[PDB]
Structure 1
Amino acid sequence: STIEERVKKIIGEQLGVKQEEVTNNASFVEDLGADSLDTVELVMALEEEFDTEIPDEEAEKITTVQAAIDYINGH
């Protein structure tokens, strides 16, 4: 259970997409069809599963799985 696997499984559980089908370049709104609001409870659970606190300025920066993965592995 690496950082990438955890991030992808959070994304799959939140947006309902199978984790085995999640891609690193998937975009929350355009590709996965996540509403701007859904993407906010998204950021909420990212923090919940990595016991961190994502500042708002960075929360707006993450829009793809890749983003979140980088931000998390980097802390």
Structure 2
Amino acid sequence: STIEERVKKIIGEQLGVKQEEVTNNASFVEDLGADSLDTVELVMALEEEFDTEIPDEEAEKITTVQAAIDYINGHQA
């Protein structure tokens, strides 16, 4: 599996949205319906899976599925 597939799967699971709905251009809040808690829980789920901590101010600007995939490809070690 690819990072794209693994990140999309976690997002779908965390947000309770079907896979075909988690497109690379989808906005977590505007398109996937995420609320305040969802944001906190999503960020922590991805920090655990990919073993990397993201500054909260930085996570705040990651608004789309593609932005999350990019961060991960750029920071996981």
Runs of 4 or more off by more than 3 Å in structure 1? none
When structure 1 is superposed on structure 2, of 42-51 and 12-21 the one drifting more is: 12-21
1:69 positional shift: 0.5
Gap regions ≥5 residues in structure 1: none
- Distance in 2, Cα, partners of 1:56 & 1:21: 26
Q: Secondary structure at the match of 1:47?
A: helix
Aligned residues: 75
Taking structure 2 as the reference length, the TM-score comes to: 0.88
1:21 positional shift: 3.2
Taking structure 1 as the reference length, the TM-score comes to: 0.90
- Distance in 2, Cα, partners of 1:36 & 1:28: 11
Q: Is the 8 A contact 1:43 1:59 kept in 2?
A: yes
Q: Is the 8 A contact 1:29 1:36 kept in 2?
A: no
Q: Is the 8 A contact 2:47 2:54 kept in 1?
A: yes
Number of the residue aligned with 1:34:
34
- Distance in 2, Cα, partners of 1:39 & 1:64: 12
Q: CA RMSD in A?
A: 1.1
Gap regions ≥5 residues in structure 2: none
1:24 positional shift: 0.3
1:57 positional shift: 1.9
1:65 positional shift: 0.5
Q: Secondary structure at the match of 1:74?
A: helix
